Design an enzyme around this catalytic site. Structure first.
Site, PDB file in Angstrom:
ATOM      1  N   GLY A 101       0.795  -1.221   0.000  1.00 43.79           N
ATOM      2  CA  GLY A 101       0.000   0.000   0.000  1.00 43.79           C
ATOM      3  C   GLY A 101       0.827   1.270   0.000  1.00 43.79           C
ATOM      4  N   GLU A 102       0.341   2.308   0.707  1.00 45.55           N
ATOM      5  CA  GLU A 102       0.990   3.619   0.757  1.00 45.55           C
ATOM      6  C   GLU A 102       0.901   4.287   2.125  1.00 45.55           C
ATOM      7  OE1 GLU A 102      -1.388   4.235  -2.474  1.00 45.55           O
ATOM      8  OE2 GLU A 102       0.231   3.689  -3.867  1.00 45.55           O
ATOM      9  N   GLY A 103       1.915   5.091   2.457  1.00 44.73           N
ATOM     10  CA  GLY A 103       1.899   5.896   3.679  1.00 44.73           C
ATOM     11  C   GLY A 103       1.154   7.189   3.398  1.00 44.73           C
ATOM     12  N   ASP A 147      -0.576  11.955  12.914  1.00 40.80           N
ATOM     13  CA  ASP A 147      -1.462  11.162  12.040  1.00 40.80           C
ATOM     14  C   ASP A 147      -1.735   9.783  12.650  1.00 40.80           C
ATOM     15  OD1 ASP A 147      -1.609  10.333   8.428  1.00 40.80           O
ATOM     16  OD2 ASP A 147      -3.198  11.011   9.798  1.00 40.80           O
TER      17      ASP A 147
HETATM   18  N1  LIG Z   1       4.698   4.866   5.969  1.00 39.67           N
HETATM   19  C1  LIG Z   1       4.488   3.754   6.127  1.00 39.67           C
HETATM   20  C2  LIG Z   1       4.179   2.375   6.359  1.00 39.67           C
HETATM   21  C3  LIG Z   1       2.833   1.964   6.486  1.00 39.67           C
HETATM   22  N2  LIG Z   1       1.695   2.758   6.390  1.00 39.67           N
HETATM   23  C4  LIG Z   1       0.363   2.165   6.364  1.00 39.67           C
HETATM   24  C5  LIG Z   1       0.043   1.453   5.059  1.00 39.67           C
HETATM   25  N3  LIG Z   1      -1.217   0.629   5.117  1.00 39.67           N
HETATM   26  C6  LIG Z   1      -1.254  -0.411   4.037  1.00 39.67           C
HETATM   27  C7  LIG Z   1      -2.479  -1.291   4.172  1.00 39.67           C
HETATM   28  C8  LIG Z   1      -3.755  -0.469   4.147  1.00 39.67           C
HETATM   29  C9  LIG Z   1      -3.706   0.641   5.186  1.00 39.67           C
HETATM   30  C10 LIG Z   1      -2.450   1.480   5.053  1.00 39.67           C
HETATM   31  S1  LIG Z   1       2.786   0.276   6.867  1.00 39.67           S
HETATM   32  C11 LIG Z   1       4.515   0.133   6.892  1.00 39.67           C
HETATM   33  C12 LIG Z   1       4.937  -1.195   7.364  1.00 39.67           C
HETATM   34  C13 LIG Z   1       6.134  -1.337   8.049  1.00 39.67           C
HETATM   35  C14 LIG Z   1       6.366  -2.606   8.553  1.00 39.67           C
HETATM   36  N4  LIG Z   1       5.533  -3.649   8.394  1.00 39.67           N
HETATM   37  C15 LIG Z   1       4.412  -3.399   7.705  1.00 39.67           C
HETATM   38  N5  LIG Z   1       3.530  -4.415   7.519  1.00 39.67           N
HETATM   39  C16 LIG Z   1       2.199  -4.495   7.054  1.00 39.67           C
HETATM   40  C17 LIG Z   1       1.326  -3.412   7.094  1.00 39.67           C
HETATM   41  C18 LIG Z   1       0.117  -3.468   6.409  1.00 39.67           C
HETATM   42  C19 LIG Z   1      -0.219  -4.588   5.660  1.00 39.67           C
HETATM   43  C20 LIG Z   1       0.657  -5.664   5.610  1.00 39.67           C
HETATM   44  O1  LIG Z   1       0.423  -6.729   4.780  1.00 39.67           O
HETATM   45  C21 LIG Z   1       1.845  -5.628   6.328  1.00 39.67           C
HETATM   46  N6  LIG Z   1       4.080  -2.210   7.180  1.00 39.67           N
HETATM   47  C22 LIG Z   1       5.127   1.315   6.558  1.00 39.67           C
HETATM   48  C23 LIG Z   1       6.580   1.503   6.279  1.00 39.67           C
HETATM   49  C24 LIG Z   1       7.300   0.521   5.601  1.00 39.67           C
HETATM   50  C25 LIG Z   1       8.660   0.676   5.383  1.00 39.67           C
HETATM   51  C26 LIG Z   1       9.314   1.820   5.812  1.00 39.67           C
HETATM   52  C27 LIG Z   1       8.587   2.800   6.459  1.00 39.67           C
HETATM   53 CL1  LIG Z   1       9.381   4.270   6.950  1.00 39.67          CL
HETATM   54  C28 LIG Z   1       7.242   2.645   6.721  1.00 39.67           C
END
Ligand SMILES: N#Cc1c(NCCN2CCCCC2)sc(-c2ccnc(Nc3cccc(O)c3)n2)c1-c1cccc(Cl)c1
Length: 344
Positions: A22-24, A139
């Site tokens: 997804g996206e931040g 946020d």
């Molecule tokens: N910004 C942001 C992130 C996220 N924002 C939320 C995204 N989310 C996607 C699904 C729908 C709702 C919005 S998540 C993220 C991250 C970091 C570590 N583990 C995971 N795992 C994860 C999170 C969501 C779904 C999934 O299958 C695994 N995500 C990150 C991230 C990953 C790498 C580096 C950095 Cl600095 C941040």
């Protein structure tokens, strides 16, 4: 390099088997297999160099993540970028892959009071550290709260984070705001830039209400609708809380509304723990100056089973109070990420 959609994801050969997550607030997130540490990781691609505001946010996010070291805040494992400023067009941030988030969990899972209590404790423990560093997340929401298979909770995305600046928090009525609508404190719509710690406490209060019912408490459909949803539950603000709002347009708007009485928390959440509702009430206080602070919230009787101030660490090196051009910010982003380079 490998492609994911129609965009280059140049993390190989160390990171392979890419899958879109997804996206931040900005940036594209993928899962990948780390061929070196033999574990799956999450990687965020950031392309900010064409804009000053994006460069500022990218620089702050990286500075904050690298300075922070706390169990309830996800850290950076690695940063991938070109060996030279001229060749650098993108930045890839590597973090441990978390299994899920509170948003995805709340869609299909009922939380026990024990899970609510534990998640809230971990959110506030991470927030204590953030606020102790003179930083505001700005946020906080269920999708920014990551969880593993044992319910360990980690706060993510410091993309809209800022150094606290309470002396410059005042603004006019109806000022545009960047952070997610449903978790915005009522003062954002009235007279606040969201530069005080009380803005994060409101968001945590919204998260607590959401954990109790599996539905956002204030699902505003547009800017001002968000304030209407808040006053619909808290009721009309008191004369004392209105006197705190000096801005005439914001005060006269509130005075023009028909009087609404407070909806009791025990009627909105009839199955909730009474101590959880007492804490909810204190976090979802209209007046930001009367709103509970993170340390007070941790000391609340609802969190009695976990509260241990000696095991709730604070930041060793807090941040201090910018308008540099994007070319100078590119140099700072390049310098900030230098320690992850192969030669280093
Ligand atoms: N910004 C942001 C992130 C996220 N924002 C939320 C995204 N989310 C996607 C699904 C729908 C709702 C919005 S998540 C993220 C991250 C970091 C570590 N583990 C995971 N795992 C994860 C999170 C969501 C779904 C999934 O299958 C695994 N995500 C990150 C991230 C990953 C790498 C580096 C950095 Cl600095 C941040």
């Amino acid at each position: 390099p490998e492609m994911v959609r129609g965009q280059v994801f140049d993390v190989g050969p160390r990171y392979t088997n890419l899958s879109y997550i997804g996206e931040g607030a900005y940036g594209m997130v993928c899962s990948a297999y780390d061929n070196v540490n033999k574990v799956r990781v999450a990687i965020k691609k950031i392309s900010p160099f064409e804009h000053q505001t994006y460069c500022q946010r990218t620089l702050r996010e990286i500075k904050i993540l690298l300075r922070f070291r706390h169990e309830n805040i996800i850290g950076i494992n690695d940063i991938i970028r070109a060996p030279t400023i001229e060749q650098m067009k993108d930045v890839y941030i590597v973090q441990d892959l978390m299994e899920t988030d509170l948003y995805k969990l709340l869609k299909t899972q009922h939380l026990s009071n024990d899970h609510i209590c534990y998640f809230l404790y971990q959110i506030l423990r991470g927030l204590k550290y953030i606020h102790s560093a003179n930083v505001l997340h700005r946020d906080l929401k269920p999708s920014n709260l990551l969880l593993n298979t044992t319910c360990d909770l980690k706060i993510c995305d410091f993309g809209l984070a800022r150094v606290a600046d309470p002396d410059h928090d005042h603004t006019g009525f109806l000022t545009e705001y960047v952070a997610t609508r449903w978790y915005r404190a009522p003062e954002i719509m009235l007279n606040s830039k969201g530069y005080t710690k009380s803005i994060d406490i409101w968001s945590v209060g919204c998260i607590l209400a959401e954990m109790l019912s599996n539905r956002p408490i204030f699902p505003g459909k547009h800017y001002l609708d968000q304030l209407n949803h808040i006053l619909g539950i808290l009721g009309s603000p008191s004369q004392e809380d209105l006197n705190c709002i000096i801005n005439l347009k914001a005060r006269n708007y509130l005075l023009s509304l028909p009087h609404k009485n407070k909806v009791p928390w025990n009627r909105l959440f009839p199955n909730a723990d009474s101590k959880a509702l007492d804490l909810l009430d204190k976090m979802l206080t209209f007046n930001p100056h009367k709103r509970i602070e993170v340390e007070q919230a941790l000391a609340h009787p609802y969190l009695e089973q976990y509260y241990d101030p000696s095991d709730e660490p604070i930041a060793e090196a807090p941040f201090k109070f910018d308008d540099l051009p994007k070319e100078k910010l590119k140099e700072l982003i390049f310098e900030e990420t230098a320690r992850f380079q192969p030669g280093y």
